[PDB]
Amino acid sequence: APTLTARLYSLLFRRTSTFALTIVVGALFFERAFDQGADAIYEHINEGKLWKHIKHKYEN
Amino acid sequence: AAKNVVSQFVSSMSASADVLAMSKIEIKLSDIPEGKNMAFKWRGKPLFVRHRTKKEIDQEAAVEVSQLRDPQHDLERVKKPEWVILIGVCTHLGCVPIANAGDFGGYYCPCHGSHYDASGRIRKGPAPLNLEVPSYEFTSDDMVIVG
Amino acid sequence: NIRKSHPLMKIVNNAFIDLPAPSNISSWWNFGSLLGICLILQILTGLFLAMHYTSDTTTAFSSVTHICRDVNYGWIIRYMHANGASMFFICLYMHVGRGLYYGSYTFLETWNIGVILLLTVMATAFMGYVLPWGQMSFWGATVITNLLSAIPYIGTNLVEWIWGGFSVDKATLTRFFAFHFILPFIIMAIAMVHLLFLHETGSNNPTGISSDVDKIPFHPYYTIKDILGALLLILALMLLVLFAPDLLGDPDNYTPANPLNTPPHIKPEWYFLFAYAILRSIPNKLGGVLALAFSILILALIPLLHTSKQRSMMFRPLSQCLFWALVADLLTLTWIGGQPVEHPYITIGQLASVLYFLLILVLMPTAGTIENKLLKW
Amino acid sequence: SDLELHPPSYPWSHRGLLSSLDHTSIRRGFQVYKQVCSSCHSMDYVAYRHLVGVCYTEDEAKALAEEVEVQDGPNEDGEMFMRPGKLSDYFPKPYPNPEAARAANNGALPPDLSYIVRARHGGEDYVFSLLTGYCEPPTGVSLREGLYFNPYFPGQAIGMAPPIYNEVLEFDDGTPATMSQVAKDVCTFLRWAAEPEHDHRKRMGLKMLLMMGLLLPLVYAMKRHKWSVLKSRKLAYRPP
Amino acid sequence: GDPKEEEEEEEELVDPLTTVREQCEQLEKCVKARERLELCDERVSSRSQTEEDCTEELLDFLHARDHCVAHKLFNSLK
Amino acid sequence: GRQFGHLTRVRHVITYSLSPFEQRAFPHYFSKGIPNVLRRTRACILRVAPPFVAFYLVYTWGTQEFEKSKRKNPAAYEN
Ligand code: HEM
Ligand code: HEM
Ligand code: HEM
Ligand SMILES: C[C@@]1(c2ccc(Oc3ccccc3)cc2)OC(=O)N(Nc2ccccc2)C1=O
Ligand code: FES
């Protein structure tokens, strides 16, 4: 039983190759998860959007 | 934060208001002479049309597909033979082709040099693609639109 | 491999990596690099705004709105520019204050170059502000330009010359666009010359005592200290852009052109307030503009008035009190410069104006002399 | 003459830090510009497409644009006719050369358009309180001609006839076109006409504090790490 | 009084700003300003030829009214 | 410029130091920092603060006079 940060260090941080690979792969997900999670926060507090407003007009 | 602000700054150089025009200019084309060439704008981009005289039909009724770079036949190109509906830019660079001045059909992009015909499709030079005139729909024999 | 030999990286290394710097420079020292960031900020956004702005009298106000409504993200770029101009002054002010308090002006050349850099950016921001051809842009342009008319004998040929006509019109908006585009490149060159003279001695520090016995490399230390501080400059800039776009921005520039009608109470941008109050104080044309010029041109007299045997004000209780009285006085000038020329205000405004000069030209130097005596030096 | 009062207190639903607009109220507000304000005030910078995003629908935007006639470009004769109504250039311009608005309204020039932020301190409120606050002209002061009196405005006196409560309506919903309700909507809409970016900006703005709240502590910790070595260093002087 | 005339009161048209103004126009600091106004409102009727204005005494009153107008109002609107 | 190796002469001082990966970046951040800021505050209030309250007092007075003098005014014109 080593620790987490240790595992992370051994497998990914030691080399600048992996270190860099890990962060670019980290940004790809962070951006996607931050945008989503953050939009939903923006929406939940508002709700006088163009969204809910739409619902009213699938017609023409 | 870096690609967000770099994207925004980059996306700013893309077009701004421009989601263009209506066009469809009411065209009467059994109105214009036997076979003269007419050009309008459909978003500020020259659209040129000749009629399609008897003698002129068959120069394009005799095509050739077995030796091309893009596929078709004039009659197979548009919906009705003696009635085609061209645009007018040139797939090479952006030199607007002139009315029946070169070889084959009529077309001929100068700006340097390249050929086309009455169907427009490129046959001789530097340009890689056939040009493009959206659809061709008239409405009735006497009237017309574009696309 | 080596940073030291390559004719190019050698400059970089000697400026940002191996430069020996005081172990003890404070947050107050972060502003010079923030002024550099400001200049670059102004340069990038400035440029992208130039890809869409048009310099003709008619479409000027309009093209700017084209940017804020039509051009993708123009609004964010436009606000960063405007709010970047304010930050730039915030930084100038701190930077110049830091130099006064800590005696940094004793580096003659680099301080003198700084004054030039100060006037250059003020010239730059002025031309900038006129660009959208709003009411204040126009009247502000009219006020400031007319200062030159006070100059004896050649005053009017000069304003008309700078106008390219009989008043701020067509010709002026176009030339101001031009000069406003080139000035920041010229600023950039002066700043490199500023940095050159500074490296000759290296940085000063809070104590005013030589740090050659305790130098550290600019690189790991000030590299990160500067990064952290850039992010702070950024937060403060975004807060404005993203929560308070119009806060420092006068509502009247949101209304086009009126060479016929001057707004009721025209109000300078913010960073001109204190100087505006000084100019206004004195009811005289010539003397106002003279007082105005002197109010800024005084920085270059500062070094002659150093009187203390110590460099910094860190060990100088008297000078410290007078320094803040100076700051408090400037803050008063600011308040007053943004107020109507009337009863309580003109008198307050005249007393603050004598105080500013009274404390720089006489109070500070006398404090220094009594601090020396108190110490038996 | 030189005396005057300032606007009340703003409870808008677009006043706080993060705070969208009630896009339904932006609708109603356009309707107010459409039927009432339009006949006097030019709104030179907005267009039918701009609404597509905000209050209407693609198809709806076209339809509303089609209810007017602009002066379309010349054809072969060197003409100048009229056309159904695009979707690409609002511009119902009530008056040609501005002086025509002066002639009609009598001196007074019906100003600007996409209002607030515009030259009016206390933007939306000033307007709301201007429209909603017409009142009886108190004793001692006459009005050179029955101009029109308004407690707010600069100089309490001048210009525009009180155009609110002539209960024009076409609010679908089932919303009572009352004095106030029509004003709240018109100011709300005018807010969006002056600042269309308003909602995106605060969503970004959110992200800026959220990101800054991550990065600030982190970058700070990076600097302390590297500065550790100096902060805890120990000195000793050992002369002969 | 009576329902059919309530929708007619809705067609004769309705109250928003009025019920709130009336209710605020009613209040402490307000009646005080109105009272200061009413008094000055009289001293100009007095010499109804040759004399000043009463613009100022009016402004004070709106200030107090519209203030509590803004606080309370909007809750009713929609 | 000047380079490490040619700055100045130092004799007899020892500097002991630790690796960043061996120490904390925030040891007693609050335990020792708060007291420290209180102390730097005390050390400078008397010089920094007074000029500003002086401006503050003139700020409130000044505006007070402005309002009462011009607007509010129209005091007596009695006949
Ligand atoms: C419709 C609901 C409407 C609104 C809203 C509106 C707004 C408005 C503002 C905000 C002003 C600004 C006051 C100022 O500049 O400080 C203003 C001014 C004038 N208006 Fe208006 N207006 C609306 C409608 C109309 C209508 C239908 C008319 C014509 C009858 C009209 C007229 C005027 C005039 C004249 C002015 C100028 C006031 C002045 O400076 O003398 N408005 N309006
Ligand atoms: C790279 C050189 C620069 C260029 C090309 C540039 C370009 C422009 C343009 C096109 C405008 C008009 C558009 C608008 O108003 O938004 C403008 C306005 C302005 N710029 Fe610059 N600028 C430059 C450097 C500066 C500098 C050094 C400053 C001073 C910090 C500055 C501060 C301003 C200001 C205050 C305005 C008026 C802003 C407003 O309120 O609209 N810019 N600039
Ligand atoms: C374009 C405007 C300016 C830029 C880009 C600029 C840039 C810098 C930089 C990078 C430093 C290095 C360290 C530090 O942050 O302090 C510095 C130091 C200094 N600058 Fe500037 N500065 C500018 C305006 C000024 C002004 C207006 C003055 C004075 C009128 C000035 C005089 C000095 C002095 C005296 C120092 C000495 C450093 C010290 O004593 O601590 N500079 N500047
Ligand atoms: C932004 C601004 C400006 C910019 C730079 C300036 O340069 C100085 C700043 C401080 C001290 C001296 C000059 C001064 C004003 O440009 C401008 O038109 N104004 N507006 C203005 C309003 C009233 C009188 C005079 C000017 C500015 O504030
Ligand atoms: S662009 Fe037409 S031949 Fe080159």
Q: Work out the number of other CB atoms within 10 angstroms of the CB of residue C122.
A: 15
Residues 6+ apart with CB under 8 A from D25: A48, D13, D184, D185, D188, D189, E78
For residue C153, the distance in angstroms to the closest alpha carbon of chain D comes to 39
- Binding-site residue positions of C for heme b: 81, 95, 180, 194
Contacts of F among chains (3+ CB pairs under 8 A): C, D, E
Residues 6+ apart with CB under 8 A from D191: D12, D14, D21, D116, D123, D124, D198
**φ/ψ (deg, to 5) at B38:** -125, 140
**φ/ψ (deg, to 5) at F70:** -90, -75
The answer to whether the beta carbons of residues B41 and B21 sit under 8 Å apart is: yes
Across the interface, whether the CB atoms of C74 and B12 are under 8 A apart is answered yes
Name the interface residues of C facing B (CB cutoff 8 Å). 44, 48, 51-52, 66, 70-74, 76-77
User: Given CB atoms, is E56 within the 8 Å cutoff of chain F?
Assistant: yes
DSSP state of D72: P
Across the interface, whether the CB atoms of A48 and D21 are under 8 A apart is answered yes
The per-residue b/e assignment along C60-83, b for 16 or more CB within 10 angstroms, e otherwise, is bbbbbbbbbbbbbbbbbbbbbbbb
Chains B and D form CB pairs within 8 A to the count of 9
Q: Check pocket membership of C35 for ligand 2, CB cut-off 6 A.
A: no
CA distances from A36 to A25, A32, A43 (A): 17, 6, 11
Q: What type of residue is C375?
A: L
- What CA–CA distance (Å, rounded) separates D194 from A3? 56
CA distances from F42 to B89, C233, C314, F46, F49 (A): 77, 28, 15, 8, 11
Q: Is the dihedral of CA F45, F47, F52, F57 positive or negative?
A: positive
Q: Check pocket membership of C129 for ligand 4, CB cut-off 6 A.
A: yes
Domain with C87, as residue range(s), is 1-377
* Ligand 5 pocket test, candidate residues B89, B92, B108, B130, most atoms within 8 A of CB: B92
The answer to whether the beta carbons of residues C39 and C47 sit under 8 Å apart is: no
The reply to whether D160 sits in an annotated binding site is yes
For residue E9, the distance in angstroms to the closest alpha carbon of chain F comes to 42
Q: Check pocket membership of D32 for ligand 1, CB cut-off 6 A.
A: yes
Minimal CA–CA distance to D236: which of C319, C72, F17? F17
Task: Tell me the HSE value of C228 on the side-chain side, using a 13 A CA sphere.
Answer: 21
The residue to which tokens 């020792």 are assigned: F32
User: Given CB atoms, is E55 within the 8 Å cutoff of chain D?
Assistant: yes
Angle, CA of E8, E9 and E11, to the nearest 5°? 55
E70 contacts in chain D (CB < 8 Å): 8-11
- What CA–CA distance (Å, rounded) separates C242 from E31? 43
Do D22 and D141 belong to one domain? yes
Q: Could you give the 3-state DSSP secondary structure of residue B144?
A: strand
User: Nearest bound ligand to CA C49?
Assistant: 2
Number of domains in chain C: 1
Q: Work out the number of other CB atoms within 10 angstroms of the CB of residue C162.
A: 16
For residue C314, the distance in angstroms to the closest alpha carbon of chain F comes to 10
Across the interface, whether the CB atoms of F18 and D228 are under 8 A apart is answered yes
- Most D CBs within 10 A among C224, C239, C247, hence the mutation to make, goes to C224
- What CA–CA distance (Å, rounded) separates C142 from C134? 12
Q: Check pocket membership of B113 for ligand 5, CB cut-off 6 A.
A: yes
B17 contacts in chain D (CB < 8 Å): 49, 88
User: Given CB atoms, is E25 within the 8 Å cutoff of chain D?
Assistant: no
Experimental technique used to determine this entry: X-ray
Q: Could you give the 3-state DSSP secondary structure of residue C217?
A: strand
- What CA–CA distance (Å, rounded) separates D186 from D28? 7
Q: Could you give the 3-state DSSP secondary structure of residue D213?
A: helix
Window D:175-204, CB contacts with A under 8 Å: 202-203
E and B touch per CB criterion (3+ pairs under 8 A):
no
Minimal CA–CA distance to C48: which of C83, C15, C8, C75? C75
Domain with D223, as residue range(s), is 197-240
CA distances from D93 to C49, C254, D42 (A): 29, 20, 5
The answer to whether the beta carbons of residues D7 and D121 sit under 8 Å apart is: no
CA distances from B63 to B105, C63, C244 (A): 11, 51, 67
The reply to whether D55 sits in an annotated binding site is no
B and D touch per CB criterion (3+ pairs under 8 A):
yes
The phi-psi region of residue D82 (left if phi > 0; otherwise alpha if psi is between -120 and 50; otherwise beta) is: beta
Q: What is the 3-state secondary structure (H, E, C) of E2-51?
A: CCHHHHHHHHCCCCHHHHHHHHHHCCHHHHHHHHHHHHHHHHHHHCCCCC
The answer to whether the beta carbons of residues E25 and E66 sit under 8 Å apart is: no
Residues 6+ apart with CB under 8 A from C257: C57, C61, C133, C135, C138
Number of domains in chain D: 2
**φ/ψ (deg, to 5) at F19:** -75, 140
User: Given CB atoms, is D141 within the 8 Å cutoff of chain E?
Assistant: yes
The answer to whether the beta carbons of residues C168 and C176 sit under 8 Å apart is: no
| Nearest atom, ligand 1, residue D120 CA | 16
- What CA–CA distance (Å, rounded) separates C122 from C93? 12
Q: Check pocket membership of C250 for ligand 4, CB cut-off 6 A.
A: no
F46 contacts in chain C (CB < 8 Å): 321
Residues 6+ apart with CB under 8 A from B90: B96, B97, B109, B111, B114, B127, B131
For residue D230, the distance in angstroms to the closest alpha carbon of chain E comes to 56
- What CA–CA distance (Å, rounded) separates C130 from C60? 10
The C-alpha R_g of chain C, in whole angstroms, comes to 22
Domains and CATH numbers, chain A: 1-60 (1.20.5.260)
Both tokens assigned to B144: 């017309």
Query: Out of F4, F8, F52, whose CB is closest to C328?
Result: F52
Both tokens assigned to D19: 């705070």
Domain with F40, as residue range(s), is 1-79
Q: Which fold has domain E1-78?
A: Helix Hairpins (1.10.287)
For residue E39, the distance in angstroms to the closest alpha carbon of chain D comes to 12
What H or E segment, with its residue span, contains residue C215? strand C215-217
Task: Tell me the HSE value of F57 on the side-chain side, using a 13 A CA sphere.
Answer: 6
Minimal CA–CA distance to B49: which of B97, B92, B93, B90? B97
Both tokens assigned to C297: 């041109």
Q: C360: exposed, middle or buried (C-beta count within 10 Å: 0-12, 13-18, 19+)?
A: buried
Do D105 and D158 belong to one domain? yes
DSSP letters along C108-133, please? Answer: HHHHHHHHHHHHHHHHHHHHHHHTT-
Do D54 and D158 belong to one domain? yes
Minimal CA–CA distance to D138: which of E58, E52, E26, E31? E58
Residues 6+ apart with CB under 8 A from F33: none
Query: Out of B8, B13, B17, whose CB is closest to C51?
Result: B13
The C-alpha R_g of chain B, in whole angstroms, comes to 18
DSSP state of C299: G
Experimental resolution (Å):
2.3
Residues in chain E: 78
Do D219 and D122 belong to one domain? no
For residue D39, the distance in angstroms to the closest alpha carbon of chain C comes to 21
Q: Could you give the 3-state DSSP secondary structure of residue A14?
A: coil
Query: Out of A34, A38, A53, whose CB is closest to D23?
Result: A53
Query: Out of B12, B14, B17, whose CB is closest to C77?
Result: B12
The answer to whether the beta carbons of residues D216 and C231 sit under 8 Å apart is: yes
Active site residue B112: yes
Q: Check pocket membership of C268 for ligand 4, CB cut-off 6 A.
A: yes
- What CA–CA distance (Å, rounded) separates C82 from C89? 11
Minimal CA–CA distance to E62: which of E19, E17, E16, E21? E21
With both helix axes pointing from N to C terminus, report the angle between C317-337 and C273-281 in degrees, rounded to the nearest 10.
80
- What CA–CA distance (Å, rounded) separates C237 from C77? 12
Q: Check pocket membership of C132 for ligand 2, CB cut-off 6 A.
A: yes
- What CA–CA distance (Å, rounded) separates B101 from E52? 88
Both tokens assigned to F29: 């951040």
Q: Work out the number of other CB atoms within 10 angstroms of the CB of residue D98.
A: 11
The answer to whether the beta carbons of residues D208 and D215 sit under 8 Å apart is: no
Minimal CA–CA distance to C64: which of C131, C137, C125? C131
Q: Work out the number of other CB atoms within 10 angstroms of the CB of residue C363.
A: 18
Residues A12/A15/A21/A27 CA torsion (nearest 10 deg): 70
Minimal CA–CA distance to D7: which of D122, D169, D171, D138? D122
Query: Out of F14, F17, F19, whose CB is closest to D236?
Result: F14
Minimal CA–CA distance to D198: which of D186, D210, D189? D189
Residues 6+ apart with CB under 8 A from A5: none
Q: Work out the number of other CB atoms within 10 angstroms of the CB of residue C177.
A: 19
DSSP state of B33: -
Closest Cα in chain E to F76: E52
Q: Could you give the 3-state DSSP secondary structure of residue A36?
A: helix
DSSP state of C212: T
The phi-psi region of residue D162 (left if phi > 0; otherwise alpha if psi is between -120 and 50; otherwise beta) is: beta
Contacts of range B20-27, beta carbons closer than 8 Å, 24 or more positions apart:
B20/B44, B20/D88, B21/D88, B22/D86, B23/B146, B24/B145, B24/B146, B25/B146, B26/B143, B27/B143, B27/B144, B27/B145, B27/B146
Domain edges within chain E: 1-78
Do D65 and D132 belong to one domain? yes
Closest Cα in chain A to D22: A48
The answer to whether the beta carbons of residues E60 and F71 sit under 8 Å apart is: no
Chains C and D form CB pairs within 8 A to the count of 70
Number of domains in chain F: 1
CA C165 and chain centroid, separation: 29
Do D216 and D113 belong to one domain? no
Both tokens assigned to C365: 């130097």
Both tokens assigned to C364: 């500070």
CA distances from D209 to A39, C87, C242 (A): 14, 19, 10
Do D82 and D57 belong to one domain? yes
> CATH code at F76?
1.20.5.210
DSSP letters along B47-77, please? Answer: EEE----HHHHTTTTS---TT-SS---HHHH
DSSP letters along C2-41, please? Answer: -TTTSTTHHHHIIIIIS-EEETT--GGGGHHHHHHHHHHH
- What CA–CA distance (Å, rounded) separates D127 from D114? 12
E15 contacts in chain D (CB < 8 Å): 178
CA D86 and chain centroid, separation: 24
B and C touch per CB criterion (3+ pairs under 8 A):
yes
Minimal CA–CA distance to C15: which of C185, C175, C180, C218? C218
End-to-end CA distance of chain D: give it in Å, rounded.
87
Chains E and F form CB pairs within 8 A to the count of 6
User: Given CB atoms, is D138 within the 8 Å cutoff of chain F?
Assistant: no
The answer to whether the beta carbons of residues C243 and D18 sit under 8 Å apart is: no
- What CA–CA distance (Å, rounded) separates D239 from D233? 20
Q: Pairing between strand B27-28 and B143-144?
A: antiparallel
- What CA–CA distance (Å, rounded) separates E21 from C41? 51
If you take atom 26 of ligand 4, which residue's CA is the nearest one? C140
Q: Work out the number of other CB atoms within 10 angstroms of the CB of residue B134.
A: 11
> CATH code at D15?
1.10.760.10
The answer to whether the beta carbons of residues C312 and C206 sit under 8 Å apart is: yes
> CATH code at C233?
1.20.810.10
- What CA–CA distance (Å, rounded) separates C365 from F50? 21
Task: Tell me the HSE value of F70 on the side-chain side, using a 13 A CA sphere.
Answer: 15
User: Given CB atoms, is F73 within the 8 Å cutoff of chain C?
Assistant: no
F61 contacts in chain C (CB < 8 Å): 344
Q: If you measure from the C-alpha of residue B137 to the centroid of ligand 5, how many angstroms do you get, rounded to a whole number?
A: 28
DSSP letters along chain F, please? Answer: ---TTSS----SEEEE---GGGS-SSTTHHHHHHHHHHHHHHHHHHHHHHHHHHHHHHHHHHHHHHHIIIII-------
Residues 6+ apart with CB under 8 A from C261: none
- What CA–CA distance (Å, rounded) separates E68 from E59? 15
Minimal CA–CA distance to B86: which of B76, B99, B73, B95? B99
User: Given CB atoms, is E52 within the 8 Å cutoff of chain F?
Assistant: yes
